[PDB]
Paper text:
Type I and type II Aβ42 filaments were present in both DS cases. Type I Aβ42 filaments have a crossover distance of ~30 nm and are composed of two protofilaments packed with a 21 symmetry. Type I Aβ42 filaments, representing ~50–60% of the filaments in both DS cases, were reconstructed to ~3.2 Å resolution. As previously reported for type I Aβ42 filaments in AD29, the structure extended from Gly9 to Ala42 in each S-shaped protomer. Type Ib Aβ42 filaments, reported as a small fraction of the total Aβ42 filaments in sporadic AD (sAD), were not observed. In contrast, type I Aβ42 filaments and type II Aβ42 filaments are formed by an Aβ42 isoform ending at residue Ala42. Type I Aβ42 filaments have been previously reported as the predominant type of filaments in cases of sAD with abundant parenchymal Aβ deposition in the form of core plaques, while type II Aβ42 filaments were found predominantly in cases of FAD (AβPP V717F and PSEN1 F105L mutations), as well as in other neurodegenerative diseases, in association with parenchymal Aβ42 deposition in the form of more diffuse deposits. In the two DS cases, we observed both types of Aβ42 filaments, present at similar levels. Our cryo-EM study shows the presence of type I and II Aβ42 filaments, probably reflecting the presence of parenchymal core plaques and diffuse deposits in the two DS individuals.
Adult individuals with Down syndrome (DS) develop Alzheimer disease (AD). Here we report the structure of Aβ and tau filaments from two DS brains. We found two Aβ40 filaments (types IIIa and IIIb) that differ from those previously reported in sporadic AD and two types of Aβ42 filaments (I and II) identical to those found in sporadic and familial AD. Tau filaments (paired helical filaments and straight filaments) were identical to those in AD, supporting the notion of a common mechanism through which amyloids trigger aggregation of tau.
Author numbering:
A (entry chain E), B (entry chain G), C (entry chain I), D (entry chain C), E (entry chain A), F (entry chain J), ...: 9 to 42
The structure:
């Protein structure tokens, strides 16, 4: 018998304020210019 | 017997205020200019 | 016997206010100019 | 009998303020110019 | 009988302020220019 | 001065033959039974 | 002066033959039963 | 002066034959039963 | 003056045959039952 | 003057045959039951 519970993944846990750049959770490939 | 419960994935957990840039949860490929 | 329950995926959990940029949940390809 | 509980993964635990660069949780491949 | 609980992984535990560079939690491959 | 060119994203680069299952490029939510 | 060129992202580079299961490029959320 | 070129990301470089399970390039959240 | 070229990331370089389980390139969160 | 070239990252360099379990390149969070 197996169980997994109350597992969490959070990228940004708290607030984001006044960014003038680039904020990305998960990026796969691509180009980011900030 | 197996179970998984109360699993969560959150990119942005708290508020986002006054961004003048680019905020992306998940990006695959593409170009981001901020 | 297997079960999965109460699983959630949330990109933006809290409010978004006064953005003057670009907010994208999921982006695949494309060009974002902010 | 096995169980795992209250396991968490957090990239950014506290707030992000006034970034003018690039903040990425998870990056796979790609180019980041900040 | 085995159990694991209250295990956590945190990349950035406290706040990030005014970055003008590049902050990445996990990077696999890719190029980062800061 | 910045430029990005000849960037491509391809889900299936070569041919698909005689599938009796389910082939999906991008899936968001939903249920797939194959 | 910055440039990025000839960048590619490919999920399946070669052919797919006779699948009786499920092949998905990118999956976000959802349930896949194969 | 900076440049990046001929960068590639490939999930499956060669052919996939006769799968009766589940093949996913990128998975974010969700449940996969194979 | 800086340059990066001919950089590659490949998850599966050669062929995949007759899987009856689950093959995932990149997985973020979620539950995989094979 | 700096350059980096012919750099590669490969998770699975050779073929995968007849798996009845779970093969994952990169896993972040989540639960894998094989």
């Amino acid at each position: 018998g197996y169980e997994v519970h109350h597992q969490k993944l959070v990228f940004f846990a708290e607030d984001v304020g006044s960014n003038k750049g680039a904020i990305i959770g998960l990026m796969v490939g691509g180009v980011v210019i900030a």
